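ARCHIVE RECORD
Type: protein–small molecule complex
Small molecule: chloride ion
Source of inputs: curated submission
Record status: active
Notes field left blank by submitter.
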Amino acid sequence: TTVFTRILDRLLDGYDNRLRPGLGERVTEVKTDIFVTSFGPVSDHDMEYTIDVFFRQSWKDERLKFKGPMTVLRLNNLMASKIWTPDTFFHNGKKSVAHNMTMPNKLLRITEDGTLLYTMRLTVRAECPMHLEDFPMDAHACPLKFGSYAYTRAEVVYEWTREPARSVVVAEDGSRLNQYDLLGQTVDSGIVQSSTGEYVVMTTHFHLKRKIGYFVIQTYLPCIMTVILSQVSFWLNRESVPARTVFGVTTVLTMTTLSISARNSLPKVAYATAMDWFIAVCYAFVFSALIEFATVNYFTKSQPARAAKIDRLSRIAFPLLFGIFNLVYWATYLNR
Amino acid sequence: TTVFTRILDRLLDGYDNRLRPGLGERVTEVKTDIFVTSFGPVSDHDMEYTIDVFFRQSWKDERLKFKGPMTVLRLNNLMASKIWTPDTFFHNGKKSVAHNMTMPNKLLRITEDGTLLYTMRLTVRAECPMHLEDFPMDAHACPLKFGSYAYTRAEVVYEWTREPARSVVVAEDGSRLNQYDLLGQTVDSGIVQSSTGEYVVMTTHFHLKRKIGYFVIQTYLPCIMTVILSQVSFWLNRESVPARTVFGVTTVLTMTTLSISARNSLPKVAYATAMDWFIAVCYAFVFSALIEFATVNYFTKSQPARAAKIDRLSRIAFPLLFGIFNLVYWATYLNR
Amino acid sequence: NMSFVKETVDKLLKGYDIRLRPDFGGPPVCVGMNIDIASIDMVSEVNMDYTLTMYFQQYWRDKRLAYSGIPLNLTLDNRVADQLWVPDTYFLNDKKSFVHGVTVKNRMIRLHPDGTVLYGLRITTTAACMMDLRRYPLDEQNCTLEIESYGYTTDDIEFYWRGGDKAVTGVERIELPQFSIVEHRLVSRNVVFATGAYPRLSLSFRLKRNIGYFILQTYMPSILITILSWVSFWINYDASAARVALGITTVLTMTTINTHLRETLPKIPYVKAIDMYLMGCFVFVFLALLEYAFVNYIFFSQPARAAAIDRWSRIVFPFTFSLFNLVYWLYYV
Amino acid sequence: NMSFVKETVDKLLKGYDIRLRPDFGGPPVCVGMNIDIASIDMVSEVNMDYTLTMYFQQYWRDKRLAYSGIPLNLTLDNRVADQLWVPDTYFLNDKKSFVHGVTVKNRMIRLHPDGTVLYGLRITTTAACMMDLRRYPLDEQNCTLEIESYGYTTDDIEFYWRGGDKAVTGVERIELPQFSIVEHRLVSRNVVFATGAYPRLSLSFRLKRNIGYFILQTYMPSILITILSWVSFWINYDASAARVALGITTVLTMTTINTHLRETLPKIPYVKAIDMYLMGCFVFVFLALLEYAFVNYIFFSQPARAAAIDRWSRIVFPFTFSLFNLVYWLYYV
Amino acid sequence: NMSFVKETVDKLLKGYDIRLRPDFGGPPVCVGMNIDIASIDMVSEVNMDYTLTMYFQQYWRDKRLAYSGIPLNLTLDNRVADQLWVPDTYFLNDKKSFVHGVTVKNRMIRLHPDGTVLYGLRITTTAACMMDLRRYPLDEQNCTLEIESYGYTTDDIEFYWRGGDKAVTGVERIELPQFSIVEHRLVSRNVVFATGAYPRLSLSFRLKRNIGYFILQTYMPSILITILSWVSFWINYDASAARVALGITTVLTMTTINTHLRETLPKIPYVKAIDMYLMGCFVFVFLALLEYAFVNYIFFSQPARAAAIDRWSRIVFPFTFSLFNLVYWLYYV
Amino acid sequence: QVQLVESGLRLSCAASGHTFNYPIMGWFRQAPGKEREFVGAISWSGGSTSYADSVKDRFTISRDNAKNTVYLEMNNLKPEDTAVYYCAAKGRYSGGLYYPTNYDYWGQGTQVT
Ligand SMILES: *[C@@H]1O[C@H](CO)[C@@H](O[C@@H]2O[C@H](CO)[C@@H](O[C@@H]3O[C@H](CO[C@H]4O[C@H](CO)[C@@H](O)[C@H](O)[C@@H]4O)[C@@H](O)[C@H](O[C@H]4O[C@H](CO)[C@@H](O)[C@H](O)[C@@H]4O)[C@@H]3O)[C@H](O)[C@H]2NC(C)=O)[C@H](O)[C@H]1NC(C)=O
Ligand SMILES: *[C@@H]1O[C@H](CO)[C@@H](O[C@@H]2O[C@H](CO)[C@@H](O[C@@H]3O[C@H](CO[C@H]4O[C@H](CO)[C@@H](O)[C@H](O)[C@@H]4O)[C@@H](O)[C@H](O[C@H]4O[C@H](CO)[C@@H](O)[C@H](O)[C@@H]4O)[C@@H]3O)[C@H](O)[C@H]2NC(C)=O)[C@H](O)[C@H]1NC(C)=O
Ligand SMILES: *[C@@H]1O[C@H](CO)[C@@H](O[C@@H]2O[C@H](CO)[C@@H](O[C@@H]3O[C@H](CO[C@H]4O[C@H](CO)[C@@H](O)[C@H](O)[C@@H]4O)[C@@H](O)[C@H](O[C@H]4O[C@H](CO)[C@@H](O)[C@H](O)[C@@H]4O)[C@@H]3O)[C@H](O)[C@H]2NC(C)=O)[C@H](O)[C@H]1NC(C)=O
Ligand SMILES: *[C@@H]1O[C@H](CO)[C@@H](O[C@@H]2O[C@H](CO)[C@@H](O[C@@H]3O[C@H](CO[C@H]4O[C@H](CO)[C@@H](O)[C@H](O)[C@@H]4O)[C@@H](O)[C@H](O[C@H]4O[C@H](CO)[C@@H](O)[C@H](O)[C@@H]4O)[C@@H]3O)[C@H](O)[C@H]2NC(C)=O)[C@H](O)[C@H]1NC(C)=O
Ligand SMILES: [Cl-]
Ligand SMILES: [Cl-]
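STRUCTURE (tokenized, with ligand):
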């Protein structure tokens, strides 16, 4: 055991951790990969998402070469606080956590050639600016950007450990999503520029699509049923005025309550979503049925022929128009 | 700069920060004052208030006499951790913050005679016990008591820097009160005694008076209008049963709704506040008017003279009693 | 002379080993405890806990710190506590505790010439208190603070309430919005775990609920709503819209009261007495509305009987509701 | 003798390289785990997690700390834990954890002459438990805690449950108002990541939700409104006012009930069982109103067939509703 | 050849005194500020504060750190910030701030050959902003951030914006759902306290509230319900079911939307514009319900009077509501 | 204070009083020449149970709150079971479950052959 103590004492003898490996000689290359252990909840209200990752970095430092009985030293993470490590940060991160139970969740491994593998376990809350014009049939690309904080592109660059498509790997049972599906991810690297210089940035877009079954069972089917119930009033006999008044008032009030309920759970955006348009059209159809009934009742004694003609025309007009609208709406929003 | 480094090194050479100045020889006298940069919100439910202060202390330390080109050294605040400082704490504090952004918000200054000025920026959450029997016409004196935690009166005493009335200064713009109005503060000092000995306590009372206009236009006016409307029905003809019934039932329903819904606004206490008495008396007046109408309607068409007498007496009995009650109530709760 | 005091203090800490308790390997060290309660903030039924602020003082003796030539108690800067041995005392039934740290860490170290150490802290702790709500609102609770040594067994440490029953002070001037502290009690014992026997102190309070809060929040609104529901019996059955509106309003408001009370208490599977009372009030308002429906149905045939039903209801409903309230309140006796 | 013990401990920590694990470069070191559960504070369906408080004990052997001549097990002050090697154990599914630190960090170190170290912590952890609420409010959950080595593979460290099935105690202390622990299970396995294979312990609990009258009172309004909707079939067509009044009352009440239950039920945006039950009830009242409309339409042409249609509906509607309820209570139970 | 760089860095910090500012005892040290606003988070009307994430850069010159022979701007590990003097810049109006610390502390230290130091932090801060919500939701606010030196007066330090009006970057890219930023302004002055005069920088934004959401959520539903309640006057009094359902549903829905909105509204001690509009709409719908109740009673005996009242209401209600809208939209616009 | 009554092959232990403060009832047996030995314990509310190795899968413990009573059902009796049986109550924060010292209120010695 004392051999390894002597090796470690020699490695840190005259070592300056303020200086990046290669300062003034060549650019430091860091290879990164991510293992998403759980893709956490996505919040529309805060336009953010949480993610839990194993974040892995690997670089080369020629001051840490050694020759001994073991080819790789798998050291305690304490050693990682005595050498130089990258200052990687997440550009759109909001408030991340570096887990400290029961010990700092970090690992450091040194190879005899001077290659260091440094891994940590993080929870990151990141900004995902969402456009909700297609709610609830919308899709989002939530981005995760990271890079060096202090060292510019002429000092530190970042690469992916392997092919970029396979350098961000998602765990099989790592879905904490209730109203979204994780379709996949795309991986890219680029250059950002700020007042302090040009930096390398590594980006991952996770593509999400919102589940729709809840809204189908809570809003769309009740609204369709309400519109149908209003439109089957044209078959009531014109003499039974009280029955048709009750039917029209019933459908109007039902649509009102459903619309008010649906507005309550809508995200607080400053424009119209798809569900708003559907609800508005259903309300227009229901009120149109009521107004048609009023007009028909107006000509009941004056011109019975006119009222009969209006009823007969409406009986085929209203279902046809509602079907055309439904076909156009669903073909527009379920195909994009 | 070398001269000042030599001076500081000589000052801290052989200096023990575990011992107060003049230990075993005299009493350390600490002169304090407070600059309240914002008097934060008061919370009735938790019985507490927030306050942000510059807390200033000053004391003599003969171990820190020096002689050099400058009479006063305005030092980096970390020097505060190398010398002795008072352990002042707030007796009614709940959970305070010593702000650490971007650096520890403290200043340390050393005069050539050994005088120390030590100032810090704090946020204090303090307990303010409240008796709300006079709600919403209640007034409180929220206290702020501070003193030494470990040094009894025979070791450390506290004094105000200037005259006590002017040692606590509140900024002109620093008022984050919504529901209250700050009428001023009173400054005092005294002795407290506990199991560990006798300590000096410095006390500041901030006098708050609650704003009442919100409740006048939110609770009192609806009740007064409802009572007036209920008493209006006495002037209608006994023949017009539908109108009097509308008045009586509508006023009773409004009074019931007001009494029930005002519960959420009112503070959650185990006794009855002044507004509770007002609402109860208004409810009694409205229900008595309804019962008077019922009694009149009972005697109609059988003993019309008795109904006439009841209505004639009521038209003067109800407004007079309500006016007397309002006079007495407002005199009781406004001259106090 | 501070030079002599500095020499003495440096000598005391010369070679001092903080990893070893006083009289290590010998008889147990005895720690006496005092608590001064400053406040009991928020008793919560929903969270099943309460908050407590206190001055917690520990008293022990360490002969390694005996000094001579200075006839004074040495109150040292609190950072000296980091260079001395202190007991590993903890609260078993706590959930989140902190030591106040403005303007410094609220800590006190006082040495005495015989080696006695007084070690004081100011602590705010949230402690668990499971509650029995079967007798709401006339329930009575018993909330404890349990104090134990985490690492040392009864072979190494011992606890006692320093001062007998006069160890805990400030309890008699505690005011709570809903409760009153009927009694407090001090207990000492030994508790055996798989790792051995540990000393234990217990400070318990008995809380009694003030019924003035349940009244004026749940009882008075229910009575008012039931009275308003009764009002509808005095209107002619021709006025259908008025009576239907009155019945519906009373039903909805009573439902609001039920939900509000249920939210102020934790959700449990069984049914308590208070739930039975609220269900009874709901039954009464719904029965008034249903009686109107029955009168309206039977009105077409026998209008005289339709009026007689209202006349009888005017007496039956208040009387039965009063009897129901009497039965409910005599259930608790 | 305290000086002898101090020199022995100094010799133990003299030349001790904390950066290296026991038996570095050789066989793996075996660490045994014990958990003693204090409570499970809360179990949140909205946040999808649960809060657990425990005493977590780790047992291992370090030959560098073997001492002779002292026939005692040395309980050291917990600060010594900063000078000793400890396993880098972590919990994979925890989201926010902390070690209690009043009055000192709740930490215990005990040494034995053989060189065996016992290391104990008091930990509160909010662990993620993804719940399937598609059968709410009669769902059954399985919440786990995963314990794993972070930096050491199975070539360096080994994990096992000390005592086997008796490694976890205090399950009787768990008192959830809304759930009831059915079973707990201990698992030992290996998990492979891109950096190698790591030991893994897993403690799982099976939870059953408690059913009561308050769970029952979510279906009763819908059932009652459905039966009210049926009632219309027994009214003659001449009195169509009653039929239309029943139709409008039932439809409005059903929609309001559904929107209110959406508002009050926990915000879980996917289809559950109760959502489909409420949708079925709404469909039934809608079908009843539609049947009335059809009868009103064909009345002037086939009065006998209209009466036959009403009479057949009087049986068909309760029969199909009973069938729907039977299918529901067989599929979701 | 990192030996030369390491030797230079060791020489820089050899006789360095962190307790003294650059040019201690002489002329003040200039500090230039840059701010890059990454995002502006929730602007809470309840808490009276906002949140700001920024890259905050400070620039100054220290002659003790000048080095020669190295034609590079030495970026150093951020931990070297603990061995250097940095300004004690603080924010006067901030309630809660932190520096991001994943994966390490988000801090940058860069040296230049002539001794210039660039020191960058990434700060998320919540800052107190007092809002006047009387014109809510049609109000215009002004929220600031104050930057000051705590210990050094104008004799020791002096601030300035580095770049003039271009010092602050990224304001034009911020998108807020409820607000649109109209202007941002930079001010530099001196603030005098009892301890002396200190330099102050102020960054202020003038925020304007978007009216789209409130139209889509509050105003349009309230107007729709108020208009829909007028359908009663156009329904024959024999159709009592429809009229009763209209009145009850409109009143209930008005209360529903009022509660849903008022939950989001702050618990301020004054009445906002939106409150006035909602109370007016409630008064209108309740008056319509009451008018129908009165008409429904007296229709049996006085059909002509009931018909006349309905005919008058058809004109009276829309006219009064239009006048109310005119008064409101002229007062608040 | 909690009062315990012993009846009794099925043994009954009826506990009355402040049984909410003492949420666990346990069973112990004492040999004529040995010390008290833990047998089993049951939670008052959840019914969760724990047994000793020597009696596991043979004895069973149940409880009912109708009269606040607990029951020990003995199956497959052996001559090794000849001991005097006690029923005891344990507080909420009294530590380990297998140690007789932690139990406050004790029943009456019942002879079983
Ligand atoms: C996981 O990471 C978190 C931080 O993200 C750690 O929490 C910090 O832990 C460190 C190490 O224990 C703490 O540092 C020490 O604090 C002592 C005082 O603590 C009290 O006061 C602070 C406020 O000042 C409170 O935040 C805290 O809760 C306590 O009430 C100091 O006395 C220590 O100083 C000693 O060491 C320094 C080293 O430079 C010397 O200079 C001193 O002279 C002295 O010897 C030390 O500073 C830190 O305060 C904790 N912060 C917070 C916010 O909790 C977790 O502990 C960590 N977990 C694990 C398992 O590693
Ligand atoms: C809230 O609820 C808790 C229970 O959860 C109550 O706590 C109990 O309080 C009673 C006192 O009222 C405690 O009873 C006393 O315990 C003392 C300690 O006993 C230990 O040591 C003895 C050996 O000396 C062991 O046999 C025993 O098992 C313990 O290890 C005893 O010394 C006391 O005995 C004295 O009084 C009794 C009569 O009560 C006499 O017969 C004795 O001779 C002697 O004078 C006594 O038994 C009990 O231990 C507490 N239980 C727990 C779990 O702590 C709280 O009282 C309650 N709060 C309120 C306000 O009521
Ligand atoms: C909550 O949900 C979790 C799943 O998410 C359940 O956890 C599973 O529990 C079962 C036991 O009920 C586990 O199955 C057992 O795994 C043991 C370990 O397997 C590992 O190691 C072996 C080599 O030793 C590898 O071959 C294997 O791939 C694993 O890496 C096995 O040793 C067990 O087999 C033994 O018992 C079975 C009968 O149970 C016999 O048929 C075998 O012959 C053998 O004797 C067994 O297969 C399973 O691994 C757990 N899954 C996970 C992911 O941990 C929880 O049980 C559940 N909670 C509750 C309360 O039910
Ligand atoms: C949100 O609300 C805040 C206030 O709460 C507004 O802040 C004010 O902003 C104005 C500028 O728009 C400030 O006014 C300017 O202050 C400058 C600094 O004053 C110092 O220096 C001068 C000498 O140069 C001293 O005399 C003075 O005592 C201070 O020490 C002045 O230099 C400016 O003067 C220039 O403009 C004026 C006209 O405005 C000319 O008359 C002058 O000749 C000169 O050209 C000017 O006075 C004001 O001080 C700020 N107030 C506070 C309290 O900070 C924000 O502007 C507002 N937000 C928005 C978006 O508007
Ligand atoms: Cl989600
Ligand atoms: Cl306020």
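CURATOR ANNOTATION: Residues C 142, 144, 183, 185, 187, 189-190, 202, 204, 206; F 21, 91, 94, 104 surround ligand 2 (CB under 6 Å).
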